[PDB]
Every structure is written in C-alpha cells, then in structure tokens.
A paper describes a structure:
We prepared RNA scaffolds containing RMP at positions –3 or –4 by annealing short RMP-containing oligonuclotides to long, loop-forming RNAs (scaffolds 1 and 2, respectively). The first RdRp-RNA structure (structure 1) was resolved at 3.1 Å resolution and showed that the RMP was located at position –3 of the RNA product strand, as expected from the design of scaffold 1. The RdRp-RNA complex adopted the post-translocated state. The RNA 3ʹ-end resided in the –1 site and the +1 site was free to bind the next NTP substrate. The 1ʹ-cyano group of the RMP ribose moiety was located at position –3 and is accommodated there by an open space in the RNA product-binding site of the RdRp. Thus, structure 1 represents an active state of the elongation complex that is poised to add one more nucleotide to the RNA before stalling, consistent with biochemical results.
Residue numbers in the entry:
A (entry chain C): 1 to 62
B (entry chain A): 31 to 50, 118 to 361, 367 to 896, 910 to 929
C (entry chain B): 77 to 191
The structure:
Amino acid sequence: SKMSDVKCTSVVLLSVLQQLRVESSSKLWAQCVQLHNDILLAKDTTEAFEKMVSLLSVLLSM
Amino acid sequence: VYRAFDIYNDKVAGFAKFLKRLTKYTMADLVYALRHFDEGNCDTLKEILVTYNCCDDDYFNKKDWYDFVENPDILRVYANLGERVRQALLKTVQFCDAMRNAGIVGVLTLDNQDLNGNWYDFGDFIQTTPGSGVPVVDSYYSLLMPILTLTRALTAESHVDTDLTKPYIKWDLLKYDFTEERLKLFDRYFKYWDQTYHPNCVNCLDDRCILHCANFNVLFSTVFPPTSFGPLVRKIFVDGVPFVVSTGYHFRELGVVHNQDVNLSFKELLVYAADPAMHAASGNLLLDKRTTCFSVAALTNNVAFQTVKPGNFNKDFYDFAVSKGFFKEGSSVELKHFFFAQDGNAAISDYDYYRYNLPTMCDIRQLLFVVEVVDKYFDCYDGGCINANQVIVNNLDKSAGFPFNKWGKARLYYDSMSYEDQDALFAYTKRNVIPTITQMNLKYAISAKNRARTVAGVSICSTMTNRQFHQKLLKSIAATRGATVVIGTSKFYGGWHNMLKTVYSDVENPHLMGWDYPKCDRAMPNMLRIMASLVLARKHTTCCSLSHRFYRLANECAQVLSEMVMCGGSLYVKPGGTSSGDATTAYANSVFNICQAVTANVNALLSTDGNKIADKYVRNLQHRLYECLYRNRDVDTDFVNEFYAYLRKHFSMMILSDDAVVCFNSTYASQGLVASIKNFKSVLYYQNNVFMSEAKCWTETDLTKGPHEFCSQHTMLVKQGDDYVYLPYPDPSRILGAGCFVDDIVKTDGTLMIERFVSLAIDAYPLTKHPNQEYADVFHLYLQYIRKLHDELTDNTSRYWEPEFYEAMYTPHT
Amino acid sequence: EDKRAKVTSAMQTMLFTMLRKLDNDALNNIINNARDGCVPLNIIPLTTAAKLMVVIPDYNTYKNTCDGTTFTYASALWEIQQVVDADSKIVQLSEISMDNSPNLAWPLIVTALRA
RNA sequence: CUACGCGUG
RNA sequence: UGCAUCGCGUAG
Ligand SMILES: [Zn+2]
Ligand SMILES: [Zn+2]
C-alpha cells in the first residue's frame, strides 16, 4: 500500500539527510525532523505525500 | 440536600456526604471536593471557586480545566483560595486557645468551620478546669493537610510582615539553617499538634517520626529561598592545597544534615569527584530560560544539543512482507511503531517535564496507616546488608556516570576498588551524605508516540552503595512466586496462566480492573518516594542502627530524589520525583502502586455512609478504620492484619513497577466497600497531582476474556492438551515494526538477524491462536523470513523454521 | 592496579585543574563572612562566577532579560562579550531584531563578563 | 555454572 | 548511551 511505502521512504530520506550532515544546521534539521515525524504519524495519504515531497525538495536543493 | 460531614460515634463513623451569619459551604465541603474529585460532579467545587473569586464561570467552559498537565493555570486558580485557607488555620488556633482558657474539651471537625474561618460548633464541649482544656485536632488538620499544599496557603509567609502586598523577604544567600523559622511556623499554624515535630530529621525516633517530620518539612520548605537547599560546601586544606568539599546537605524534607567524619586513596578520590561541589565551583554561572527549573552552573564553554537519529529501514523484510501480502490497503495490521527522530532541543525539553513535580503534603495519619498496611505486602521477603563479595552485577561494561564516564566504564571502577575499599565506601555512606550527579541521556527505542524518552545514568558510587544496601531484598522479591509483586515471574512456560490464576484467587463476584499512572516518574510526590525507601529499608532492623538507616535514607534522597542533573554540560537542580536509573526503580514503584491502591481502598470505605451498609462486619471495620486513623496514634497490629486480609480477599492485586491488575468483588465495589476507578482518580488527584483519564483505565466484566492489557501484552484463553490456558499475545504492529526498523545498520542484515527474528517469532507465536487470521499469519511470515535468511546465508536450524520450538516455549513443562 | 593508578592520576589532575580554574579572592570573602564557614553550593557560582552564560529560546525572552550590551542579573551587572547561535556561529548584536529573528538559529547563547 | 551477543517497566 | 526482570544463541 502507498501509505506504508511513503512512511518508509520518509525514514530512508531522513537517514540520507542525516548522513548528509544536515544536522550541522539546526533549523534545517528541525524542519526535516518535524516533517518526518508528521509523516510517520500521518493518517491521510495526501498530506503524507505533500510532506514527503517537501523532504525530497530539501534533499534535491543540496 | 447532601453536605460533607466528618462523623464519629458508636453507630457510624467516616468522612462522607449526609442529608442533614453563616456561609452556605463549610471547610469540609472544600476538603471533600478536592479529595473526592469527579469531573462529572464538580458543582460544589465550581460554586466555591466562583463565589470566592478564584476564577470566573467562563473558565469552566474550557475543557481539561481541571487537569494539571493540560491546563497548569488551574494551579493559579486554586492558589487564589490559599490565603483563605491560611486565615482559617490561623483562626482555628485562636479558637483552640479560647477553649484551653475556658476549660473545654472537645473534638474539632472540619464540617463545623465555615469558609470564612469562623467556628460555629459548641456541642460535645464539656467544661473542665479552666486552663486544662485540650482539643482533639488530629482529624481536622490531617484531612486539611492535602489542601494546604495544593492551594499554596503559606505563600504569605514568603513576604515581609506576612502580607502579600508588601515585598518579598530578602534572606541572606549564605544562610541555610531555617530551624528557628520552622519552629515558629509550627507554633503559629500547628500549635496544638501534640506530637513532637523535629525540623531536622536527624533527631527522629523511628521511620514513622521521619515521615511525620518530613511531611511538615515539605510544607515549611516552600517558604524558604530555593538556593539554601542542596549540598553544603566548605573550603578545606589538603596536602597544603585548597579544596572546596561537601560537608552536609539541606533537604526540603529532612532538614540540615552534617557529615560526621568531616576532616580538614581511591575511596576519597571517588567521593571528591562524585561530589558536585568541585564541578559547580569551577563552572560558570548559567541562566537557562528554556526551563522553569533552577540552573546551577555551566561546566562547558559552549552549550550542547544532542539529536536522535532516524531509525534504519530493513528493505528485505519489508519487501518480503509486501510480496507475502502484508501491509495492504485496509488491513487491520499496520505499521504504527517507528523510530522518531528528535531535534537538538529534545533532551532539555524532556527535563522540563519535571515541572509537573509539585510540593505535596500528605494526610499523615492516612499515610502512616497505609505504610503499615503496605509493609504486610513485603513480609514474606527477606532483606539486609551484604558485603562486596556477595554483590552481583549483570553488566560491567555500562556507563559509570559523570565525571566517571570520562575515564572508563563501571568495570574500571569495580576492578580498581578492592572489596575492602567498597566496604569502606559503604560504611562511609552509613555515616556521611555523598551528593552525586546523574546524567540525562536520550534513549534510542521504538515507540508509537513522537515524544522522546530520557533516562538518568547515576554515578558509580550511588549504584555500588545502593546495591550493597538493597540487593538482598531485591533478589528476594525477584525469586518469590505467588505474591502481589510479580517481578521475576516469567510469562513463558505457563507463567502467565499461573499468575492470572493467582490473581483470581477466591473473589466472590470477580471483576477485573487496570489503570495507568499519568507521568508517574515525573509527578510522583517526594513523600511517597521517601515512604517507599523506608519500606524497603525496614528489612534492616538487625544489621543497621537508626543513625545508619537515616544516613542511608539521606544518601538516597541526595542521589535520587533531589540530585544534580547534567543536561548538555550544564548542571540543574531536580525538583523531585523518582530517577529511572536508581537501583530500586522497579521495586519502589511497586511500593508506590500498592500504597496508592491501599489509599484508594481506605478512601472508598470511609467515604461510604456507614449507616446504609447492611453488613455488620464491614460497618465495624469502617468504624475501627476511622479509630485507627484519626483517634489512635500507636499502630494496631490486629486491625492492620484484618484490613490486609480484607483487601487480599476482596481486592487481589498483581503489581509490576507501574502496571497493575486487580480482581475485585463487583458487589462490594458497587456498594462502596472496595475501591473503584473513581477512587483511584480522586487519590491521584489529591495525592499525585495528576488527572487520570478513564480512557487509559480498563474494566473487564468477564474473567474468561482476561486482563485487557498488562505489561503491554493481551491475554487469550486457548486450549492446550485438553486444558485451557491464558497466553500472552503481543500487538502485531509492535512485532512487525521491530522486524522492519532497526536502530543501527550492523543488525539490518546478516547472520545476526536470524537471532532477532527467532526472538520476535518466539514473542509472536501466541498470535496464531487469535480468531483474526492476519494476526496468525504474522508468525508464519516471520517463520518464512527466518527460513529464507538461513537459505541466503547457506539440520539444527530446522527447529527455527519449524513451529514446535516456539510452541514448546508456552507449555507448562518447564 | 595499573588502570587503578591511571584513574587516580586522572582524578587528581582533574581536581587540581579545577583548582587552577578556581579563584579565592571571591571565595574567601564568603568563607570568612560565614559564621559557620558552610555555604550553599548554589550560591557559589552566583557570587563568584566571572562569566555568565544565558540561553535564550526566543526574541521576547531576549528583550525581557538581556537586550542591551549591559544587563542586570543576580544583583550584578554583566557586559555582553559574545552571542553565538545554535550552530556556534558568532551572531552580532545588530543582527538580533524582531525583523531578522526568523533568520537566527535560536536558541541564542550569550556570554557576558562581570563588570 | 561462567563469558559474550540478541530480543518487558 | 540508566536500573532491574525474563527468554534465547555460541563457546568453555
Ligand atoms: Zn521526628
Ligand atoms: Zn542493614
């Protein structure tokens, strides 16, 4: 199902961002952590997809 | 209509509602409302609050207004009544004086003083010699004590001339001895309390005297400045060099304590390094506006922010589950457990939750009877002091705490110190107080909540000495089967069924009950932690003297209750509560749970009308309970035993640190003879200062179904070899999450993963007997994945993918 | 044994280093003033610490507490020496403002010296 | 039984 | 990178 794969993609995305030294910058890490935690707790797939797109944008920018 | 009354006579006794210028409400009404709090029926409390201008009616329109955690502003509202309570107390004293001068002997009851403080009762008053009148004030002050702390009645004593309008008193920062102030407060407020009060608990006769004096000290310490409390230090000259060393400790509960072996080796080096004196002295001043707790100093040039990393994902297992049909759309079993990452402000924020620990005064007579009853639950066990050679340490590669973590692990210090050195340290702790520092560490764990978890790593010395002190009793409790406390009782090999059969023992109309302690560790009062420590130390009657036991209690309070906490290189003062890394974490929590349960039962019995109870035995039991609470100082062993038997018969309990299951008589509970969930809610309100939501508590009418939840595991009745058994099955989401998400990457795949999946399959096997088919397919999925892992790695391994190995683990053979 | 000696040496070195970090001009004052010679530990850093570190969560707390180059805390006057951010970068006094606060990595750690 | 590793409050 | 409890796996 799409929701579980969205959650797992968010997990791996935040792992990659962590290994990208994003935690060195405080506010970027705060935004990514909030987005990921909300994705994991999201009960509606569309909002989870929006937050996942935001996190992927965070990764793509760098 | 119904009004609260405190009554005592041959026919009936207790503090309950009865159908029976002056204000409309009395003081008994306020005490009843604040000690018997039910959200559904608060009309009396609402009316008292609006009539005396603590809040407006609009305040009540807000929901969760009563809850302290969700709405802390209620603490302010209640505080607006404190002054009134205080000015009632001060009036009571005057009345007593008059009676003493008039040679009148009578009992003072709460239901006879209006909320303006005026006493309108002139009955039961019998004239005697003038100047020889003696009032009975045990029940009044005892029942009113819990309200004094919640309403913050003595706040006026923190101001010049005891007037809130005038400025605060400016006490000298270097002052720490407030013995005279405590004596003055006691003589001004509790003048006719005939029991001797000791400001310093070093001069207490017995543990009960310690509890009484500490109950009064909890109230008196709120007035005094917040910097007086803590390690008392002094400059000394050692080897011709100046060292600032701790020579005492000021306790909000135990007063001033001075070390007996103060003077001016590995043992002395450890006592020096563990002491926060040196670190705080060499640390820069710190002001932290991220917290409401007191800040001591900063031992680092820069502040530290620690983060929680994201959990790793096991792609192979998740793809295997998807291919085998799990995690579909609309399926009942779904992933609800993950590793939740946290920002740099997480750790400190968790510490800020200690804001929910409030100064709490207890009903001292109730607490004394309750500790006497609770001691019965720990009679079977044996306790005492042991030597270093008899101490068992499970893992020696753990952290030694601060500053000991800098140089090595606990193995280093356990190897460096010989057994004689450890015994010398223990004897030193029996004569002197060693303050210590506990580090706060964020935990890497799976959960279904975004909130982070913090644990307290205490220093090596505290663990060593508390082990030498308590390990014998702690192992005795862990080796006993069939008791109320079920630590050490496994759930495998029929343990679950045996425990559940033990709890159901001989209840006439059995119903089942369970509850949760909201913010147990953070919100636990300090008085109850001291009581738990005293109950755990009562096993030292022969090996320890009164002074030794008091100094051990002081060490425990200065290393757990009110320690110093390093959070990111900065020292802070813990307001109270219970640490999570102390030796007696689980067992002290069990003592606290049993105490809350016995308190709920006592409140339930006394809150009953008494006249309505159509049973003579329970009516006499209620009468004698009131007698042994508010009329008899000396412990009555026979009635304590009778009440213990009554509770064991009509209130069987199963206790792990914070989880508790109860089998109770439904008819007695309906008639008020035994506690219900509402009684536990009221007790947690007036004692633990937390609101218990009925959603997190469960009640089971049918014994066949079993406990709804205990230790996070559910119960299923399944047929094994013609015999039905209770088996613990876990939430499938937890097991699937543990299988999919791992903390580190070394364990994500390889030969080691087989052990993790074998253990998860051992845990999941009971799901095969659930009526739901997906719950059962979880175990077969795990088995198939174990088999595939063996195949990829490539006779004995067969047992891992054949289900007989897992079926054996839940049969009563072993 | 050998590791025992290493631990003893390390603890002694740490204690004597903290002594080097310790000053007695302020300490002996309170020690002699005290009739007993015993003082609460908490008051020692308050009345003897040369440097003050203030952690600020947001701008409102900054304005309420220590807005200017000099402020008053613990009945003492302190002069700001540095204002680092959560990323340990040297934020300047001018940058702190209600307008630029969203572009500052709160919390802000201000280090000041006793006047 | 000892050592090491893994998996409830 | 805490205190316990229980259950497994490999070696002596
Ligand atoms: Zn006493
Ligand atoms: Zn002993």
